[PDB]
C-alpha cells in the first residue's frame, strides 16, 4: 500500500491494525518465515519489521491503469536517460 | 522445458528459397515447411527441413495440407541419407500463429515425442528474437475443461554448432570483430534500451489496451503474479535505494580504485616510453 | 608483411638426398628414407653446380 | 563451335549442402550430383546441390541412383520449382583436395550426357574460416587440342583464377583440365536476414542480457597486476646506458588496451546501475 | 542393409586383420595386416562369443 | 683459450650409442674435425 | 527384431574405428602429448567430458580417426602373460579339506585375513598389519593345496604365479613382468600374490664368477625393493612356498 | 587484418598438432626438420618462435598437410618414473626417526642449509653440496631417510632404481641414465635421486666375463 521506503517498518502498526501484541511479532513473521511469501529481515534492537520482496496482491485493474507512473515512467525514463548518455555518447560512433 | 536449440540457417536458406517459391507459385503468401531434427536434450539442433506445398482457407482457416506423397516418400529420402535427422517439428511465418497450426502440430505428434512449432521469420526487422519454439503444453485452467492443446513460449535461440564458416565467415566482407568496449556496447545499448522500453511500449499496449477492451486474458495468472516481478523496484519518487548508496561506495570503490592507480599504471605505458620513441625519433633524426 | 604469409602455405620442398647426377639434364635422387628417383631439374641451379 | 570464359553464379545453399556434405561427410570421399541451370553460353549457375545416401562403397559412376533421380526431380515438382542438373559434385575432405582417378573418368562419363558437367571437389577440414576449399574443373579433352585451348574472351577472370594455379597434381593437370571462375552471389536477399539474424543473434540476443562483471576484474586485476610486474622488467632492459640491444622487445602493448577495454567495461559496468535504474 | 553389407565386403578385398584383444565397456582391437591399430567400441556383424583375441 | 680449436665431444659418453651407433664409421666426428678443422677430438 | 539389428548394424557401417594411442603427458588443459600406438607423436584434446585428470601418463586412450581428439580411455594395459596365471586360478573347497594344521589355519588366517577384514582393529591399537610369510617342509605337502584353500577362502584377487617362468633369455623382462604385476598389484586394492619355487628366482648371492643368476641377482633386488618401495603395498598379500629355505637370500 | 593475421596465425593449429623433430636450419625462418613419420623435411618455419629454441633435435609441432613449424616443446616426457610429482612421499624423517642423528645431522647439514643459506657459502665462501653414499646392514632404516627427506622439502625427487640398466638392446641404460641427467640438468638443482648399490657396480673392471 505503500511502494516506498521505510521498509523497515516500526511494529506500531503491526501491534495496532493486525491486533497483535509486541511479543508475538516474531511468530507473526516466523510462522510468515514458515509461510514464504515474505521473508523479511527483522531488526530486533529496534524491533523494527522489516519488509522484503512479497507476494503483493491479486487484483488492482485501477492500478493495472495507473501503473503509467511506473511503467512509461521507466519507458521514457530510462529511454530517455537512455537518450542521455547516448547523447552524451553520441560523437564516439566513430 | 526447452530453452534453446541450435540453428543452422542452412534449411533457413531453404526457407528463402522456398519463399522464392511462393513468390512465384501464386496465392500462397505464407512460407510453412516441417522442421527436421532430433533431441538430445532440452538443447537441440537442427540441420535440415523441408517446405510443404500448403494451402490455408481464409473461410474455416483449419485446412490444412501435408501431403504424404510429400511426407513419407520423401521421410524415406531423408531417412535414406541420414537415418539421424528425422522430424522434430515444422514451421511457418508471420509473426503470432494461425488457426490451423495446433491441428498441424497434431499431424505429426504421432511421428515425435515432442513435435514443435517454431515460427519463422523470412523479413526480420524484429525488436526482439528470431525464431522461436513452442513445445506441447497442457496448462488448461484451474477449471477442470477439455485439455487445451495450444501450444505455449517455449524459449529457443540460434545457436550456431561447428565450423561451416568457410563460407560463412568469408561471406562477411564487411563486419569486424569489436574488442568489447569499442562501441560494441552501445549498439547493445541502442538494442536494449531502444528495443526493450519499445517492448515496454507494448507492454503500456498490454496493460492500456487490457484495461480498454481486453477480455478474460486481462488477469488471467500471470499479469499480478508478474506485477510481482514488477515490483522488484517500481516506486514513486526516486525509489530511496538508501542501501544501494554507500552499497554503491563498495562499488564504485572498485572501478575508481582501480581507474585511479591503474591508469596512473596507464599513465606509465603511455607517457614513458611515448617520451623516448618520441625524442629518439626527434632528435636522433638529425 | 602480414599477407607475405601465404607462402608459409605451400608445405616445404623436403631435403632430397642426391648421390651424383648423371647426363641429359637429370640427376639421382634417392629420397630420405625411400629408394632413387632420376627426376628433371629446375632452371634457377645448373647440372654444374 | 567456340571457347569462352565461363562463370558460375553459385546458390549459396550449394555450398551450404558441400560444407555439410563434407563436414557430416566423414573423409571417406563421396559423390553426388549437381542442379543447377545452364543459363547461358559465357557464364553457369547453381541453385540446388541435393543430397546423396550413404554410398559407403565407392566413389565411381554407379553410384547414381536414377530412381532417386526421377523421384528427386518429382519432389522439385511437387514443391515449386523442377530445375535442372548442371552437372555432379564430389568430397574430398581428407586430402589436399584435388582430381581423383575416377572423377578423370566420371566426369567423361557425366558430361558425356551433359554439356559441361563440372566437376567440384571440397574438404572443409582444411580450415574454419580462412581457407575456402571450393574447387572446379572443366575437362578440356584432346578432341579440341586442334583449336588452341586459349577462350580468353573476357580476361582477368581467369587471369585471377590463374592467379593461384598452384595444385600439385593440378597444375601437372594443366593438360586435360582447366578450371572455371566461381563468383559468390549478391545474396543480400539471404544475407541481409543472414546479417539481421547474424547480430540479433550474436550480440546478447535480445540484448536486455548483461546490461561476470566485477570479480572478472577481480581476477582481472590480478592478472592486471601479475604481469605488471614483468611488464616493467622491459624498462630494465632499457637500462643498455650507451647502446647494446637489437630490436627492443617491445612489451609495451597487450597490457595497455587490456586495462583500456577492459575498464571501459568496468566503467560503463559501473553506468550499468544508473542506466537500468533511471 | 545387406546389399551395402556384401558391399563393403566387395568394395575391395577386405583386409583380413587381426584381433588383439576385445572389451565389454561389444568392443573390440584390431591390428590390420598392414600392423595398424584401429579400435572400435561397435564390432558389427559378428558376435563376441563367435570371435577371440 | 685457443678460440676455435678445441671442440672436446668427450667420445666416449653413451659410448655403446655414441660410438657406432648411427656413426658407424664414426667419421662423422672426423667431418666434423675437418669441416672445423681448428678442433681437438678427446674421448675416454 | 533382427531387422533392428541389422539396422543397428547399417548405422554401425556409420561408425567408425578409433584410434590407440597412449598420453606421453599433459601439457595444458586441453593441450594432450600423446602418441599414436604405431608411430608418431601428437599433442591433441578430449571430447567434452573425458574426466581429463583421471587421464594419468601412461593411460591408453582411443582417438578419433580424422580429427585425432581424445574419445575415450580403457583400463591402462594388461600384458597378457599375467592373464593366464591369475583367472588360471581355481575355486576350491574351503579348509575343511586340510586337517591337522590348525595352528596354521587359525595364526596364518590372523596374519592373512585380518587387515582386509577389519584393519581397524590394528588401528585400534595403529600398529601396522605384517605383509607376509614362508610356509616351509618336505615338498608336495600341501603347500600349493593350503594356497588353494585361501583361494577358496577370501574369493577375490588372485594373483598366483608359478614364479620359474620369468628369465625367458633376456636381462629386464623379467623385472618388467615383476614391475607390471606389481602395478597390476598396485592398481586392485585387495590383491594377493602366491608363490612357488622361489630357489629357482630367489636363489642365494654368492661372489660373482658366473653369468645367469646375477639376473637372479637383479631380479632378487627388483625382490628386494619392491617388497617395500617408497610406497608399501596396500592391502597386497604376499604368500611364499618354497621347498628349499636354506639357500634364499638373508637379506629376504 | 592486424587482428585477421594475428587470429590467422592459429587457425590451422593446436587441434591436430603432429610432432616432429628439429634438425638444422639453413637461413632465416626456414629449416631442416626430421619426423616421427619417419622421413625428413626442408619446410618454412614461423616468425612465431625465439630463433634460439632451436638447438637441439627438439620436440617440435608440425601440420599434417603443411608441416609447418608453429611450436617447439624443449621437454620430452620422462626418464622412466619422474619424481612421483604429488605425495607417495612417506614422511618419517624430521619429527620422527629412530636413531640416526649423525646421519640426520649431516644430511640436514647438506641439503636443508644449502637450500637456503648460499650467503653462508659466500662469506666463508666454501662450495655448494654434491651427492653422498649410505652404508647400513639391512634393517638400518636405509630408505626411510630418502624417503621423507623426499617428503620434508619440496625438491625434485627424481629417484630411479638401476636394476633395470641391465638390458638387451646397446646402449640403452646408457639413454635412460641420461633421460635422467639431462632431465636433471632440465629442471632443477633441487634433489635428484637414484639408489643403486652394491653387486651391480663393483670395481672389478678387469674381467673380460
Ligand atoms: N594340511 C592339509 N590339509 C588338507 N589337505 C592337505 C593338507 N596337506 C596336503 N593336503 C592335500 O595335499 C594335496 C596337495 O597339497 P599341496 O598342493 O599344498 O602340496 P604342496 O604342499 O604344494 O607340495 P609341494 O609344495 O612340495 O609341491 C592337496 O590336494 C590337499 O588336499
Ligand atoms: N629408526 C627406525 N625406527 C623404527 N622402525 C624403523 C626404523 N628404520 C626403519 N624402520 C622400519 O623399517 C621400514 C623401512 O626401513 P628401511 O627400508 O628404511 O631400511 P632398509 O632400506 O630396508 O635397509 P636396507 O635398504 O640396508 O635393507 C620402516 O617402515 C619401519 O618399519
Ligand atoms: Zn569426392
Redesign the interface.
Known amino acids: 500500500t505503500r511502494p516506498a521506503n521505510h521498509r523497515q517498518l516500526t511494529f506500531e502498526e503491526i501491534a495496532k491494525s493486525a491486533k497483535i501484541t509486541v511479543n508475538e511479532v516474531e511468530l507473526l513473521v516466523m510462522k510468515a518465515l514458515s509461510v514464504g511469501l515474505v521473508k523479511g529481515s527483522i531488526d530486533e534492537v529496534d524491533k523494527r519489521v522489516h519488509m522484503t520482496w512479497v507476494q503483493p496482491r491479486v487484483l488492482d485493474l485501477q492500478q493495472i491503469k495507473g501503473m503509467k507512473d511506473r511503467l512509461e515512467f521507466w519507458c521514457t525514463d530510462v529511454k530517455s536517460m537512455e537518450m542521455l548518455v547516448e547523447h552524451q555518447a553520441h560523437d564516439i560512433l566513430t | 522445458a526447452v530453452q534453446k536449440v541450435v540453428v543452422h540457417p542452412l534449411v533457413l536458406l531453404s526457407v528463402v528459397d522456398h519463399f522464392n517459391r511462393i513468390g512465384k507459385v501464386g496465392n500462397q503468401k505464407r512460407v510453412v515447411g516441417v522442421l527436421l531434427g532430433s533431441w538430445q536434450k532440452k538443447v537441440l539442433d537442427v540441420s535440415n527441413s523441408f517446405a510443404v506445398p500448403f494451402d490455408e482457407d481464409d473461410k474455416d482457416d483449419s485446412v490444412w495440407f501435408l501431403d504424404h506423397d510429400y511426407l513419407e516418400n520423401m521421410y524415406g529420402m531423408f531417412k535414406k541419407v541420414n537415418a539421424r535427422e528425422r522430424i522434430v517439428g515444422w514451421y511457418h511465418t508471420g509473426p503470432k500463429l494461425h488457426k490451423n497450426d495446433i491441428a498441424i502440430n497434431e499431424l505429426m505428434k504421432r511421428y515425435c515425442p515432442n513435435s514443435v512449432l517454431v515460427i519463422i521469420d523470412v523479413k526480420p526487422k524484429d525488436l526482439g528474437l528470431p525464431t522461436e519454439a513452442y513445445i506441447s503444453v497442457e496448462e488448461v485452467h484451474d477449471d477442470g475443461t477439455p485439455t487445451s492443446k495450444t501450444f505455449e513460449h517455449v524459449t529457443s535461440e540460434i545457436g550456431a554448432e561447428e565450423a561451416e564458416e568457410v563460407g560463412v565467415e568469408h561471406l562477411l566482407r564487411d563486419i569486424k570483430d569489436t574488442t568489447v568496449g569499442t562501441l560494441s556496447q552501445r549498439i547493445t545499448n541502442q538494442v536494449h534500451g531502444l528495443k526493450g522500453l519499445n517492448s515496454k511500449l507494448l507492454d503500456i499496449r498490454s496493460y492500456l489496451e487490457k484495461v480498454a477492451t481486453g477480455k478474460l486474458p486481462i488477469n488471467h495468472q500471470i499479469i499480478y503474479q508478474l506485477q510481482d516481478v514488477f515490483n522488484l523496484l517500481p516506486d514513486v519518487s526516486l525509489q530511496e535505494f538508501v542501501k544501494a548508496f554507500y552499497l554503491k561506495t563498495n562499488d564504485q570503490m572498485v572501478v575508481v580504485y582501480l581507474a585511479s592507480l591503474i591508469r596512473s599504471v596507464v599513465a606509465l605505458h603511455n607517457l614513458i616510453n611515448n617520451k623516448i620513441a618520441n625524442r629518439d625519433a626527434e632528435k636522433k633524426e638529425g | 608483411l602480414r599477407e607475405e604469409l601465404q607462402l608459409l602455405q605451400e608445405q616445404g620442398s623436403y631435403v632430397g638426398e642426391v648421390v651424383r647426377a648423371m647426363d641429359k639434364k637429370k640427376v639421382l635422387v634417392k629420397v630420405h628414407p625411400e629408394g632413387k628417383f632420376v627426376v628433371d631439374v629446375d632452371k634457377n641451379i645448373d647440372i654444374n653446380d | 563451335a567456340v571457347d569462352t570464359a565461363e562463370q558460375v553464379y553459385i ?3 550449394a ?3 558441400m ?2 556434405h563434407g ?2 561427410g ?2 571417406m570421399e563421396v559423390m553426388g550430383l549437381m542442379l543447377g541451370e545452364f543459363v547461358d553460353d559465357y557464364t553457369v549457375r547453381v ?1 540446388d546441390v541435393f ?4 554410398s ?3 566413389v565411381s559412376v554407379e553410384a547414381v541412383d536414377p530412381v ?1 533421380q526421377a ?2 526431380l518429382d ?1 522439385l515438382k ?4 523442377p530445375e535442372m542438373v548442371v552437372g555432379w559434385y564430389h568430397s574430398h575432405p ?1 586430402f ?1 583436395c584435388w582430381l581423383s582417378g575416377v572423377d578423370i573418368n566420371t566426369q567423361q562419363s557425366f558430361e558425356a550426357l551433359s554439356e559441361r558437367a563440372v566437376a567440384v571437389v571440397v574438404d ?10 571450393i574447387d572446379a574443373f572443366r575437362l578440356i579433352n584432346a578432341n579440341m587440342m586442334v583449336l588452341g585451348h586459349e577462350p580468353r574472351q573476357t580476361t582477368s577472370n581467369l587471369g585471377h583464377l590463374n592467379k593461384p594455379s ?1 595444385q600439385a597434381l593440378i597444375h601437372g593437370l594443366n593438360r586435360h583440365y582447366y578450371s572455371i571462375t566461381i563468383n ?1 552471389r549478391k ?1 543480400e ?6 546479417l ?16 561476470v562483471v ?1 570479480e572478472m ?1 577481480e581476477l582481472a ?1 590480478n592478472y ?1 597486476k601479475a604481469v ?1 610486474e614483468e611488464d ?1 622488467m622491459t ?1 630494465e632492459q ?1 637500462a643498455i646506458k650507451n647502446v647494446g640491444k637489437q630490436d627492443p622487445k617491445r612489451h ?1 602493448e597487450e ?3 587490456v ?13 550499468l ?1 544508473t ?4 | 542393409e545387406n546389399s551395402e553389407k556384401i558391399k563393403v565386403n566387395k568394395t575391395l578385398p577386405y583386409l583380413v586383420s587381426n584381433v588383439i584383444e576385445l572389451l565389454d565397456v561389444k568392443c573390440a582391437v584390431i591390428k590390420t595386416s598392414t600392423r595398424q591399430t584401429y579400435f572400435l567400441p561397435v564390432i558389427g556383424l559378428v558376435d563376441a562369443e563367435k570371435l577371440k583375441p | 683459450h685457443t678460440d676455435c680449436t678445441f671442440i672436446r665431444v668427450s667420445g666416449s659418453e653413451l659410448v655403446q650409442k655414441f660410438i657406432g651407433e648411427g656413426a658407424r664409421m664414426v667419421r662423422e666426428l672426423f667431418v666434423m674435425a675437418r669441416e672445423h678443422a681448428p678442433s681437438i677430438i678427446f674421448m675416454d | 527384431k533382427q531387422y533392428e539389428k541389422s539396422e543397428n548394424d547399417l548405422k554401425a557401417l556409420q561408425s567408425v574405428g578409433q584410434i590407440v594411442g597412449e598420453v606421453l603427458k599433459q601439457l595444458t588443459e586441453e593441450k594432450f602429448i600423446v602418441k599414436a600406438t604405431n608411430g608418431p607423436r601428437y599433442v591433441v584434446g578430449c571430447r567434452r567430458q573425458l574426466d581429463k585428470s583421471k587421464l594419468k601418463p601412461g593411460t591408453r586412450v582411443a582417438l578419433d580417426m580424422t580429427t585425432l581428439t581424445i574419445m575415450r580411455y580403457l583400463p591402462r594395459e594388461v600384458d597378457p602373460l599375467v592373464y593366464n596365471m591369475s583367472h588360471e586360478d581355481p575355486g576350491n573347497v574351503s579348509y575343511s579339506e586340510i586337517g591337522g594344521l590348525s595352528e596354521q589355519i587359525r595364526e596364518l588366517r590372523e596374519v592373512i585375513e585380518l587387515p582386509l577384514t577389519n584393519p581397524e582393529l590394528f588401528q585400534r591399537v595403529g600398529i601396522i598389519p605384517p605383509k607376509g610369510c614362508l610356509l616351509y617342509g618336505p615338498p608336495g605337502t600341501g603347500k600349493t593345496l593350503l594356497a588353494r584353500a585361501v583361494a577358496s577362502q577370501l574369493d577375490c584377487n588372485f594373483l598366483k604365479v608359478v614364479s620359474s617362468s620369468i628369465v625367458d633369455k633376456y636381462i629386464g623382462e623379467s623385472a618388467r613382468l615383476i614391475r607390471e604385476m606389481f602395478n597390476y598389484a598396485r592398481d586392485h586394492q585387495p590383491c594377493i600374490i602366491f608363490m612357488d619355487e622361489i630357489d629357482a628366482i630367489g636363489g642365494r648371492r654368492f661372489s660373482e664368477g658366473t653369468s645367469a643368476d646375477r639376473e637372479i641377482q637383479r631380479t632378487l633386488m627388483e625382490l628386494l625393493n619392491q617388497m617395500d618401495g617408497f610406497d608399501t603395498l596396500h592391502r597386497v598379500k604376499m604368500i611364499m612356498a618354497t621347498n628349499r629355505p636354506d639357500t634364499l637370500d638373508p637379506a629376504l | 587484418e592486424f587482428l585477421h593475421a594475428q587470429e590467422e596465425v592459429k587457425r590451422i593449429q593446436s587441434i591436430p598438432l603432429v610432432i616432429g623433430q628439429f634438425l638444422e636450419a639453413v637461413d632465416q625462418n626456414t629449416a631442416i626438420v626430421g619426423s616421427t613419420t619417419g622421413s625428413n623435411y626442408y619446410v618454412r618455419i614461423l616468425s612465431t618462435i625465439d630463433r634460439e629454441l632451436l638447438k637441439p633435435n627438439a620436440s617440435v609441432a608440425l601440420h599434417k598437410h603443411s608441416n609447418a613449424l608453429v611450436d617447439v616443446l624443449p621437454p620430452e616426457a620422462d626418464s622412466s618414473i619422474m619424481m612421483l610429482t604429488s605425495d607417495q612421499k612417506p614422511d618419517v624423517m624430521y619429527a620422527d626417526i629412530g636413531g640416526m642423528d649423525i646421519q640426520k645431522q649431516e644430511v640436514r647439514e647438506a641439503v636443508e642449509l644449502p637450500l637456503t643459506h648460499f650467503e653462508l657459502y659466500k662469506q666463508i665462501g666454501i662450495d655448494p653440496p654434491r651427492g653422498v653414499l649410505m652404508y647400513g646392514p639391512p634393517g638400518c632404516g636405509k630408505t626411510m631417510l630418502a624417503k621423507a627427506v623426499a617428503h620434508h622439502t619440496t625438491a625434485a625427487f627424481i629417484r630411479v632404481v638401476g636394476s633395470e640398466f641391465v638390458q638387451k638392446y646397446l646402449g640403452e641404460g646408457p639413454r635412460m641414465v641420461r633421460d635422467v641427467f639431462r632431465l636433471a640438468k632440465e629442471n632443477a638443482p633441487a634433489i635428484i635421486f637414484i639408489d643403486e648399490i652394491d653387486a651391480i657396480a663393483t670395481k672389478r673392471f678387469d674381467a673380460q666375463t
Open positions: 546458390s549459396s545453399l555450398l551450404l549442402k560444407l555439410k563436414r557430416a566423414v573423409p541453385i543430397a546423396m545416401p550413404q559407403g562403397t565407392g532417386f523421384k528427386m519432389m511437387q514443391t515449386g520449382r581428407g589436399g572443409p577440414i582444411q580450415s574454419v574460416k580462412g581457407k575456402v576449399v598452384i559468390y545474396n536477399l539471404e544475407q541481409k536476414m543472414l539481421n539474424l547474424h547480430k540479433k543473434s550474436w550480440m546478447e540476443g535480445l540484448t536486455l542480457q548483461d546490461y566485477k576484474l586485476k592486471n605488471e616493467k624498462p632499457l609495451l597490457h595497455v588496451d586495462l583500456m577495454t577492459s575498464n571501459i567495461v568496468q566503467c560503463l559496468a559501473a553506468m546501475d542506466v537500468v535504474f533511471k
